[PDB]
Amino acid sequence: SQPIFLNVLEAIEPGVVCAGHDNNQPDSFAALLSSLNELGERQLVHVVKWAKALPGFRNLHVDDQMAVIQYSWMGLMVFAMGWRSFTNVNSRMLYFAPDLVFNEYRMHKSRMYSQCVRMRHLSQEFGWLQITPQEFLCMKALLLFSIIPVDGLKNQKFFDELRMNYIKELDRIIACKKNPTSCSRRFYQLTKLLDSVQPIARELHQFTFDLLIKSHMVSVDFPEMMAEIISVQVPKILSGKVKPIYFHT
Amino acid sequence: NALLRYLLDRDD
Ligand SMILES: C[C@]12CCC(=O)C[C@@H]1CC[C@@H]1[C@@H]2CC[C@]2(C)[C@@H](O)CC[C@@H]12
């Protein structure tokens, strides 16, 4: 039986996105963070177009569609950037975009060196675990469905069924074989990898929120869409109204 | 979130 789910994921996977960073200016806090915010804005456009093409996604209430996107973009973009870093520079640097690659100096200058280190460990996991492109696509799709309000969504029922289905699809393409233990071990590793994305996203969420607050004082520009989500949705996560869905406790 | 809504509505 010819697969379909994976055909779709591979087909809709977003292409290359540039930050628009001018690599001629010195590496300053203001210049680096302003370019990261622009990349986030451009990437948010692809995240939306991508999500809309995902199987079952349009069957969610429009407001729930907005919500999962507003809540999970950080995790999605970090996971993807870790994959690019792993495949383009063997996780040696953070490959945010072709025109915005962070080396050690930029990690320090960004004032988020610790968070960059944690992102680099994430990227390296793709190597340590030997994550296949298929496993990567399925895990990334599941991240879209990994954060919701504690009060639930407008149509929680359908969301829970869609989430379930994306889990079964992940289970189906895990790299294993005559050895049920290997498959069991593999699923454990992948669920653990997905969970580890959340604490990273949370640090970045805290950082960007604080940055937005003092943006005028540190000369960091926030595009319209990022400004809006960072000032309305991100606080709901930081205040505990919206929480990640973990596999493990 | 007007801009986000527009990106979702446009083409579907
Ligand atoms: C999501 C982005 C941009 C897209 C990407 O490849 C990952 C990266 C992770 C750090 C984010 C950044 C967008 C802008 C943020 C949110 C800054 O304000 C501070 C942390 C930045």
Q: Give the three-class secondary structure for A220.
A: coil
Instruction: Give Cα separations from A70 to A52, A96, A134, A141, B1 (angstroms).
Output: 14, 20, 25, 15, 9
Residue of the CA atom closest to atom 4 of ligand 1: A40
CB-based contact A75:A146 (threshold 8 Å):
yes
Q: How was this structure determined?
A: X-ray
Q: What's the number of domains chain A is made of? A: 1
Strands A147-149 and A94-97: unpaired
Q: Give the three-class secondary structure for A17.
A: coil
Q: CB-side exposure of A66: number of CA atoms within 13 Å?
A: 18
Cβ of A43 less than 6 Å from ligand 1: yes
Whether B7 contacts chain A with CB within 8 A: yes
- Ligand 1 center to A113 CA (angstroms): 13
Structural tokens at position A9: 């994921």
Interface contact A232-B1, CB threshold 8 A = yes
Looking at residue B6, the DSSP 8-state letter turns out to be: H
Interface contact B7-A48, CB threshold 8 A = yes
Residue A67: which CATH number?
A: 1.10.565.10
What's this structure's resolution in Å? 2.0
Structural tokens at position A210: 């604080």
Query: Which of B3, B5, B12 has the CB atom closest to A58's CB atom?
Result: B12
Residues spanned by the domain of A142: 1-249
Q: Position A16: which residue type?
A: V
Cβ of A40 less than 6 Å from ligand 1: yes
Whether B4 contacts chain A with CB within 8 A: yes
